[PDB]
Symmetry: none
Subunit: 297 residues, 4 copies
Amino acid sequence: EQGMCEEEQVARIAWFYYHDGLTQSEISDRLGLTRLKVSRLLEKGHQSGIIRVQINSRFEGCLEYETQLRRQFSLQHVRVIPGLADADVGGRLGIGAAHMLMSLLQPQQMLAIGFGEATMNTLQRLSGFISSQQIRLVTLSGGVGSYMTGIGQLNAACSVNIIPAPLRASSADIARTLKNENCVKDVLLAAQAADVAIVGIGAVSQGEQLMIGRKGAVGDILGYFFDAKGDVVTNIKIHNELIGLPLSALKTIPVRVGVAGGENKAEAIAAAMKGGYINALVTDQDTAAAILRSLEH
Amino acid sequence: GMCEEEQVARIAWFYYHDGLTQSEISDRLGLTRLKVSRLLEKGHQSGIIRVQINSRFEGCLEYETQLRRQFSLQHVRVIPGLADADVGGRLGIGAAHMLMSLLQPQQMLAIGFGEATMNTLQRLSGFISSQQIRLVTLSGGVGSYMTGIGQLNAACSVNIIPAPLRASSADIARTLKNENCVKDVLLAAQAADVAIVGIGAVGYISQGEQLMIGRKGAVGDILGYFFDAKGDVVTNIKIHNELIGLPLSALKTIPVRVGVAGGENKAEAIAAAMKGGYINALVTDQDTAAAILRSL
Amino acid sequence: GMCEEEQVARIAWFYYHDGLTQSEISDRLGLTRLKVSRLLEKGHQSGIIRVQINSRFEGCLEYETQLRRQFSLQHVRVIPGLADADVGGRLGIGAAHMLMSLLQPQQMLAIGFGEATMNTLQRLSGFISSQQIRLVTLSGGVGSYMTGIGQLNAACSVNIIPAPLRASSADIARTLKNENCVKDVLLAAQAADVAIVGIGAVGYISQGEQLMIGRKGAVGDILGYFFDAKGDVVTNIKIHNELIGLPLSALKTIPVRVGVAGGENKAEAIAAAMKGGYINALVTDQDTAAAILRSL
Amino acid sequence: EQGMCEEEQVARIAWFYYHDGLTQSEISDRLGLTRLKVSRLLEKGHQSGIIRVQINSRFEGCLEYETQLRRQFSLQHVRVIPGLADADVGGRLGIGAAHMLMSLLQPQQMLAIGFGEATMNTLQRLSGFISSQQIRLVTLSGGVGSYMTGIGQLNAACSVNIIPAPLRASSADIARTLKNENCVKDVLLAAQAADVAIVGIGAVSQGEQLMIGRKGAVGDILGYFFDAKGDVVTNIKIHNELIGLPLSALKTIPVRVGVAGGENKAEAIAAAMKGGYINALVTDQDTAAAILRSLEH
């Protein structure tokens, strides 16, 4: 500190390394800090999205796949990240999804957010941008503590508007009761009103899973299950136990992005955009191929 | 040929102004060290030797000493009042330094909502990460905690009650406390090693409810719970059954529990809060300490 | 079968998002490290790979870089402007950290009057004592320096000109500069290793004098001396002969000399002050940097 | 720092050592500081007059001498500090004079000050009180830099109103010119208007000293010389070269204290209060005796 808070240190380290091409350790003494600390803060700038590296070409991602995907599914935006062997697909989908949202969010707009590894992961890589552009966050679903891995990153300064309830009530009546507490009601409407949504997609509660497969549920968004035609599965108990925005209402959000990938995900992702729940998608190559395969059929 | 008093005053001057040793004084006036020791004892013993301190902090120290005696507190900080006029913000720096004295590494901290408390949490952020401190909410509200749970040792756990502060009915409150998403946190909360709260005086309450709460004899609240000037928790208040949070009896079960409080108006309230034993540590400003002490 | 561009974009993603090594990429796409190096060179070389930074500080860095090129400064700090709204006070923290980078131990610091400058001196107090820094006033006034010369390494020397800033006549000024109580300090002042001043824009001046100084084409002043938009010192100003202090020509004789300046309105003034070379280092706020840069 | 500025540390160290009688090193850990630092700050509290030790008896000083002195010279206040062998009389007069002024100054009153070892010394021992009670300082004389050893102690927060001129101009006309610069004029009136003055007294410029002795100057206050009858010596050149408040005007200040002591000082001190320039005096025993001796004659 000389006498700069962390953020400044990071923003500066960046400029010196990139815009001026200075040496890693030569930076060290110019801001009067240890060479190890320089090395750290350069990573933290990338991990938290202070540093944004844009690739400005039609070939950022797998162009061929992206374009077929827009065509077949009528997508407003699409990114297919270039494949890798054994990589943490969760973490890689992270960077991608963060970088796309950086291109989509206008200053002070509102981003609704789901739970789950990918979404939390994307939010981690978007903290720099979120505060830098005063993006306002709203939880799409209950849970409170499960969002903490993505919103624990931010400055006190950021508006994060949480639904004050757990993800799922223990019975359907309790869940209805909760949905009418002014507090929950308020954030629920807040969420619906957002500009852009970011959600994970689950593919398919030990006893319940078999019964879900039975009804030909293909995947889930925010906890709600849908078949391959994309329509939300009926007479599942969970759906009325969930506190949070129902899929019908998610649709209000002008641009809603799914970030999902993995070997089993293909048909759940596809069923997702047939249903209209997402109109933007971030995946990886192998999953893009898979989705297209599945369409030939 | 010198009076006792005249010899007391000579010794005073030499010891406290000329800073000489007793071996010096006893040697120089030809009196025994044994005598000198006794005569310094007598100068202090009564009347003569009086130590005054010149600074704004003297008043703080004083009110600190009285609060400590009068309310048998375990810990007190009186900060300078409106004279330095960042009283709110400086209040939070205080509490955060007091908490730093109290928390062992890996201990758990029960946490009230409110500005003073959110504020102090902010100042406290660095200690939390490095010392690996666990946090727990004392009440529902979730969003009103956000501004202070704001940063993270990736390793540091924060336990937030997933419910509103106040339910629209006692029954809805009761069925909510029974959700084990909520219950888990409630339980985790009273295992806390230290608690930190703010004190309110008499919006989740209507102007009407407050007027009535005033009528039933409430003087202040902690965690939304109102008590009278005797520090008894006020009875026949509906709000109490509608609250989702650790009850003031269960709060008292935490060994060290510190209050942060500011306003002139807050005096009656704070006084009552330590009569009821809801806090055994206080961080306040000099103006408020005065008011508190004048009300006795 | 991949285009050059398609191979540039793959490499970008792997290197900057997946953070892999070139030995990895070259190994995994079956292309030479030598090729990869060249293709990363080309991605940057033009268009494709662009590094953006997300923070308020980015703007500061930018304006810093431009001021540095456009005014060939030795040192620049642009601090965040009105967005953090303790702009005055935060301005002084800036300058004090810049000065800390510049002063060797036992060096001498020439000192201008004014809020910004007094303020920065305050922030700088600890460095002064420990590093044994010598101070000298650049001008008379005495009392207007008091608020910043406020503390002391018993060992630390402060050289104050024992005269008013401005004499009531050129003759009285001339005979005052000849008093060797005054002259001694004047001399000591230009031996200074670093100078720190504030910049004024267009009370020791009457409303009339200022209007006229505006008419003769003054844009700002340093140490009471006014200059035009070209940074030339304005001529045919009476005030200049009435001033007791180091003249702006003799000021320029100090190797490193830093300005601290704030207001929106101050843009024209500051610009002119570095065109005249009266400062070769600047500490300003982002709002002002913008205004300065827009005036070119 | 935990997290207390120096001043607080001092005020606290004091209370713990005196009002609670705690151990020197036991204090150390209670405020989390090194035992050497504890030892330092306890001295700094005494040296700068944060810590004031009052002795509340008629025998604080040499009572016998004090009372004779009030009687013979019509003094409003008098302190005669108990004698010591080979002690720095300058430094000892310091403590005394500081302690007396602490008893005389009402909150926010104005103290005019002369130059010289004793006065500067007294101001050093009064810094705690000065800021603690918002005492306003004004220089009685020019000099500017010669007051720096007493006013360098204070907080930025204290009003110190300096005469912006040197102590003595090089010619009498220059000195007159200066006395009419609005700036000097302003502080000059400020000085006259004070509540309490504190000044040193000089007893008797190699070539000039013999000529001063010649005219039967006995001592000096603020640079002005007076004979044994107390009247200001006439036709000395210095008197018209001095920038600062003349002795006639010093008299305006309701209570003005001299702090002077030393073997040669006796008759200069006496001539001082015969002239009316001081109406309060701080000395030491040996000088009090001497003054009284001189009156028998």
